[PDB]
Amino acid sequence: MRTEKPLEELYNVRVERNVTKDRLMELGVPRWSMWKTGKCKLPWDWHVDQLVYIEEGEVRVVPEGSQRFMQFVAGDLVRYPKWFEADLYFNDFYQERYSFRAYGD
Amino acid sequence: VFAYYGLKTPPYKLDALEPYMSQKMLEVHWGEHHRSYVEALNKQLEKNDILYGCTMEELIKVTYNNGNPLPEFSDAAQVWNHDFFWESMQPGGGDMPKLGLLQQIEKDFGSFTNFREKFTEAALALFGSGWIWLVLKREEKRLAIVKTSNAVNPLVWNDIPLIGLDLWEHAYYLDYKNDKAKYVNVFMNHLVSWDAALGRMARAQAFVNLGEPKIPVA
Amino acid sequence: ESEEEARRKNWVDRGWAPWEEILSPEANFARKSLNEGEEVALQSPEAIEAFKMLSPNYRKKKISDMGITEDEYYAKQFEIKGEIPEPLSTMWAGPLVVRHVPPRDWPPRGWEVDKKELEFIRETHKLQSVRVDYDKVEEMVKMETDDMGLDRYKMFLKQYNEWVAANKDRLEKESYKYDQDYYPGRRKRGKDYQDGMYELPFYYPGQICAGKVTAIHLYQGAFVDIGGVHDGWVPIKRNDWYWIRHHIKVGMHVIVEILAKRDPYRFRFPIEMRFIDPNIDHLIFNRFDFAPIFHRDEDTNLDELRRDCGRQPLPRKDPGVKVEEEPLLSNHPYVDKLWQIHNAEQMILDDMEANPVKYKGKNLTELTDDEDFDEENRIEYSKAYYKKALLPKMITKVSVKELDLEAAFAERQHHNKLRMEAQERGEVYKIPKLRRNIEMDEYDFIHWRRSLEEREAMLRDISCRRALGLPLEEPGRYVDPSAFGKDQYDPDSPLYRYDYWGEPKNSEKSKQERMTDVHNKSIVGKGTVWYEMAYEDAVKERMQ
Amino acid sequence: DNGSDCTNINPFSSIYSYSKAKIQQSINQPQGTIHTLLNRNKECQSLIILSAANCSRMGPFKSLGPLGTSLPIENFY
Amino acid sequence: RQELEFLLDEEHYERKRNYRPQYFAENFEQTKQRRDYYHYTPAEIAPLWHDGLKLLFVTDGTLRLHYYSPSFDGVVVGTEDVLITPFTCDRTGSGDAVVAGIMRKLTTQPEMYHDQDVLERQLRFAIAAGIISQWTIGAVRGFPTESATQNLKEQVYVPSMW
Numbered sequence A: 001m002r003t004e005k006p007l008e009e010l011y012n013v014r015v016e017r018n019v020t021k022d023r024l025m026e027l028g029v030p031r032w033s034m035w036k037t038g039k040c041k042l043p044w045d046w047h048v049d050q051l052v053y054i055e056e057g058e059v060r061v062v063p064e065g066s067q068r069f070m071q072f073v074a075g076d077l078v079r080y081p082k083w084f085e086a087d088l089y090f091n092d093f094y095q096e097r098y099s100f101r102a103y104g105d
Numbered sequence B: 001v002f003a004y005y006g007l008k009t010p011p012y013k014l015d016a017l018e019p020y021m022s023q024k025m026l027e028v029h030w031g032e033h034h035r036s037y038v039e040a041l042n043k044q045l046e047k048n049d050i051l052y053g054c055t056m057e058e059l060i061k062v063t064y065n066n067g068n069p070l071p072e073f074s075d076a077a078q079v080w081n082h083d084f085f086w087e088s089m090q091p092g093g094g095d096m097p098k099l100g101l102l103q104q105i106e107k108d109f110g111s112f113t114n115f116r117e118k119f120t121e122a123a124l125a126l127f128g129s130g131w132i133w134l135v136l137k138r139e140e141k142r143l144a145i146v147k148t149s150n151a152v153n154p155l156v157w158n159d160i161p162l163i164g165l166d167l168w169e170h171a172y173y174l175d176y177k178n179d180k181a182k183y184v185n186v187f188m189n190h191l192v193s194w195d196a197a198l199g200r201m202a203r204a205q206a207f208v209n210l211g212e213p214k215i216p217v218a
Numbered sequence C: 001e002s003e004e005e006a007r008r009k010n011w012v013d014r015g016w017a018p019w020e021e022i023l024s025p026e027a028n029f030a031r032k033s034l035n036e037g038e039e040v041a042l043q044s045p046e047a048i049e050a051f052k053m054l055s056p057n058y059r060k061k062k063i064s065d066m067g068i069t070e071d072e073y074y075a076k077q078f079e080i081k082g083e084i085p086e087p088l089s090t091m092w093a094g095p096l097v098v099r100h101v102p103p104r105d106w107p108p109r110g111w112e113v114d115k116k117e118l119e120f121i122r123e124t125h126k127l128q129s130v131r132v133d134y135d136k137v138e139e140m141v142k143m144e145t146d147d148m149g150l151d152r153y154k155m156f157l158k159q160y161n162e163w164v165a166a167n168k169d170r171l172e173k174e175s176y177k178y179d180q181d182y183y184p185g186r187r188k189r190g191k192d193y194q195d196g197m198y199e200l201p202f203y204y205p206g207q208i209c210a211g212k213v214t215a216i217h218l219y220q221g222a223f224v225d226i227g228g229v230h231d232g233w234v235p236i237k238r239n240d241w242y243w244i245r246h247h248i249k250v251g252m253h254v255i256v257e258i259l260a261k262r263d264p265y266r267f268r269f270p271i272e273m274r275f276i277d278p279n280i281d282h283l284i285f286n287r288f289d290f291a292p293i294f295h296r297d298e299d300t301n302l303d304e305l306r307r308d309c310g311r312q313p314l315p316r317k318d319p320g321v322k323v324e325e326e327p328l329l330s331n332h333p334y335v336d337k338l339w340q341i342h343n344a345e346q347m348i349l350d351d352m353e354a355n356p357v358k359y360k361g362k363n364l365t366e367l368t369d370d371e372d373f374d375e376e377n378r379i380e381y382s383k384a385y386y387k388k389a390l391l392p393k394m395i396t397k398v399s400v401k402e403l404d405l406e407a408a409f410a411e412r413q414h415h416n417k418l419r420m421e422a423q424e425r426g427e428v429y430k431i432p433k434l435r436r437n438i439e440m441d442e443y444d445f446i447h448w449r450r451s452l453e454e455r456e457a458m459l460r461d462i463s464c465r466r467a468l469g470l471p472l473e474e475p476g477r478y479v480d481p482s483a484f485g486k487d488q489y490d491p492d493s494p495l496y497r498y499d500y501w502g503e504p505k506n507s508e509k510s511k512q513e514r515m516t517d518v519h520n521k522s523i524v525g526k527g528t529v530w531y532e533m534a535y536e537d538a539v540k541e542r543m544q
Numbered sequence D: 001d002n003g004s005d006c007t008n009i010n011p012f013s014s015i016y017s018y019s020k021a022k023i024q025q026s027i028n029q030p031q032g033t034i035h036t037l038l039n040r041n042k043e044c045q046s047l048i049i050l051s052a053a054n055c056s057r058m059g060p061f062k063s064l065g066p067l068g069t070s071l072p073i074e075n076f077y
Numbered sequence E: 001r002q003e004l005e006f007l008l009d010e011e012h013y014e015r016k017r018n019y020r021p022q023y024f025a026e027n028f029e030q031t032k033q034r035r036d037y038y039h040y041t042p043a044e045i046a047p048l049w050h051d052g053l054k055l056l057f058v059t060d061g062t063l064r065l066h067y068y069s070p071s072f073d074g075v076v077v078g079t080e081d082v083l084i085t086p087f088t089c090d091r092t093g094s095g096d097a098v099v100a101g102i103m104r105k106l107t108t109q110p111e112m113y114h115d116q117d118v119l120e121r122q123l124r125f126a127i128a129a130g131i132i133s134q135w136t137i138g139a140v141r142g143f144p145t146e147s148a149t150q151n152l153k154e155q156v157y158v159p160s161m162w
């Protein structure tokens, strides 16, 4: 099929590409936690929301039982949904700024 | 850019319910609280074009997202909710239901007095803001009284609503400061619309059949 | 129970219906002859008539006795018996006042148009909120034309005309590629496609349309041609066609209302509608819960299909553990990848120190160990390793391209020079920790902090959802605690396992003997253990 | 030893792209309309696959379009 | 048959014999899911016809014998019962017997060129010969005689056929 249904909206993974720094400091990106990893595979089941601001590398997310993946460049703000089961495939140096948010902002 | 961009003025005038709900209060609820909701829904629909081309009943279900609501679910739900409410009330008053609705209430809730008692109990038992609904369940084919959260409407469970009340405080604070049971009693005695509920049940009968088939003798 | 009650139950659940069952003469005689007896004289009138009707000349004479044509008898054979319903009447509620509004989802995904024209088109959605008084409509009737304002709608049409001329060939090619055989609901192609048919984007839920019935399916429903490339579908199930067939016939002009529009790739019937003019809402009791879909060959993940169609999730076993009452996670995925390269670097440094001849003559900054390293062949598994016991083994081809031996060489040359002089001083030196171990500990710490933040957010999320009445777990996944069932249960009480009968506590196999043997050989003596403590307790006592 | 796990193919390798054409369209499925059972709704629900082997076709056997959208009504009563 | 497909088109007919109807059975006889004995239309063999050609035979082999003349077409049905003798079960020479029977009937019967029923009644002889020639190990060892082939034709077919 000529897919007009990408996995960014099929699975509710809202991605903002090329975010401006004023909105970043409005949310509180620099005042967040840290996470660093090289080439690994992290099976993770989400229990709450997560605003990931990737900093250094690249992360390819593969949902459970799927053969198509979604790629996030180093300048994206990704919001992983609740009850999400995926397998994050890392390839190179990776850094991020995350903040798990409950129901509401 | 904007769809559903209209306050959808109520059937009656703003001073039609003056002996029970002052013309100022209505003006505020409709003029300010509701209008605002629409404006924000239009601003959110301008950004996302995929959710722009969807009907209201489908937009609510697609923004509910099965427990994890999208950031525009609350607003659209409110707009729909409010619309239902204005129309769920009629000028004059509501004494008793009519041919079909009264029979269905007697079949489901036993009697109309028991129905009113359960409705008042569910209205007073709610905590915080929210709405109370008189819905028709599809798979069960019966009328039920469900209480919901701040903005959630029974459309998320595929249930046809017939009557609704706004238990959010904005509705009652001006004329009935803290006597919410009074507000309920007034809404049930001189502000409930049974003709509108009967018309909505007639419309719903095209989606849920309330009757028995004609079985041939063979 | 009673016969009437039983028939009622059947009609309600199973779907019984007394169909016509057109029979042959030879069979009619069989059905009306076996009721009396065997080799007995036929006394019933209908039995004698069926016996006489076994001759062709008798039938061709009886058809002429009543004065009927040759086709009249064949038409009367396929006649509906039983009580026929009264002809339905159309009672229109009131004036129908309508207005042509462009669809809200007009521009498809992937078609870019000018912004100002789309704005002027979407401006008409605001005007739909105004109310009109139906009774006074007659009063304001104006018969003079050429004064109606439909610029917006016209603009839509202009855009539409362009889009159809742009994408007609692509849509036809896709229809020929993905759909093999034509069926009511698919794209009209070949000889059935006439220029001027309204395509799928034209329609939108809420529009009343006039059409004719072109197909009637017993299990699916009616199919109405609304003058478009895709037909319309009205859901009518199997059992209702006993009474609905008297009111809906092929070729009847009907008025329908579109209530949903879907994607023709996934859904079989993209447009589902209801009847307006032949109102039959009192005869439909069986209804579709979910719209029909296509289970194609491209979709391999059932979860993507469920999320694209909109159905409930695949149910799983209900876990008895709680998400909040469980320990955290303190194991980082990079721990193994860093540990293996750290051990490799240590072993290479030790081997170079043992044999300085191989290390001499080459710069310690760049050491080309192996030039045939391949990333694809990095994982090698060989189960032939049976040095101590029959068990599988794996081999890891570590690359020296990323090994940071620069600082490791200095660290080792600084640590050995101090451990040797400590040994000469009459003391034993035990190195507390290294830099790679500190890095692994920092990775473990940041992963633990991530898990802690996740659970700290979960503790607030559970509260609020509970307070506001929101589902804590995804509805439709853990609904069945043990409805899925009949699995052999290890537990004896389910009876899927044995329980003592006449004191039969004996257990087959489950030899503890094999285990006993490895224990007995090393330590046969049945002595009383004196010291018993965990390894962590041993480390605690040693460090204390 | 386990090789049946085709799904473990790295998407970056050419083998993943070649497997799309190597694995042809799956026809092992019965290729029919799933017909549920209303009578078997109380017990374990079974399915009947109606296909071309069970259905036949009798050959010989011998304006239109959207009108509008209803506007909101002032006298809702 | 394989040679005719290789000359005209192989993948086209390989795809045609795997049409796989999904909704209904149009021909009303495709519901039984039997073998595909496709009778090539006279327009498909057009690039192979010429002025001097008198007859053509597709010869699926002891099952179907599609004959094409400049005035009529047709097909004859066979048996293929080689499983009656599993221990011999040798079909090394089977087309030779069919060609020999066709040549014999052509040299004896001159009406096979301008008649369709005579052609079928004479090709059944070659079919019977090819059927008998598959019950013996060796081609020259198991070639049948005229009496045996006529007996098989009279025992397999109904009297209205021959």
Ligand SMILES: [Fe+3]
Residues within 6 Å of the ligand: B029, B033, B082, B166, B168, B170, B171
């Ligand atoms: Fe309100």
